[PDB]
């Protein structure tokens, strides 16, 4: 990691947050802290969330999502490289009109993944929980994209890869950032 400040700390000074890895609790706690700190510095100026992520934990993703919606500043989202799973959910969560992807960026949407072991009753509880999680994700995606819940359900049934242009047509982003 080169020094100029380390490069990421230098970008944070200009209100840029990098989500450039798998989403786990550590990543979420850091992004949440950055968002709150930037709001405290200035509650009116835009924040910029750059996304290059294969996704990860849904609960960690929702920590970030809820913090974005809570704070006063608009959070712009820019997909560079890849936004998959909870990554694409967070891309779609940026301020309306300020969600971008670079032309060759890959966006991927699908249903949540998980696991369950044990007694029939335990598997039932796990299944009910992950289905409720999917309903919650799909409902919010419906609101953020303008697509029906029924269409989101069908389009996330298996891995669904979108070009930047397709993501724009879908309503996951607002503009393709052209050079």
């Amino acid at each position: 990691i080169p020094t100029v400040y380390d490069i990421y700390s230098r970008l944070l000074k200009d209100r840029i947050i990098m989500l450039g890895s798998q989403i786990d609790d550590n990543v979420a706690n850091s992004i949440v802290s950055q968002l709150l700190f930037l709001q405290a510095q200035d509650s009116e100026k835009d924040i910029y969330l750059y996304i290059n992520s294969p996704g990860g934990s849904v609960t960690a993703g929702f920590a970030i999502y809820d913090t974005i919606q809570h704070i006063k500043p608009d959070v712009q989202t820019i997909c560079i490289g890849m936004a998959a799973s909870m990554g694409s959910f967070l891309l779609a969560a940026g301020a309306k009109g300020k969600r971008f992807a670079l032309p060759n960026a890959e966006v991927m949407i699908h249903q949540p993944l998980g696991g369950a072991q044990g007694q029939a009753t335990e598997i039932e509880i796990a299944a009910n929980h992950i289905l409720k999680t999917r309903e919650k994700l799909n409902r919010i995606l419906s609101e953020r994209t303008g697509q029906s819940i029924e269409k989101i359900q069908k389009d996330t049934d298996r891995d669904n890869f979108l070009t930047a242009e397709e993501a724009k047509e879908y309503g996951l982003i607002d503009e393709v950032m052209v050079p």
Partner: peptide, 6 residues
């Protein structure tokens, strides 16, 4: 990525 992000 400015303009406009920032």
């Amino acid at each position: 990525f400015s303009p406009x992000a920032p």
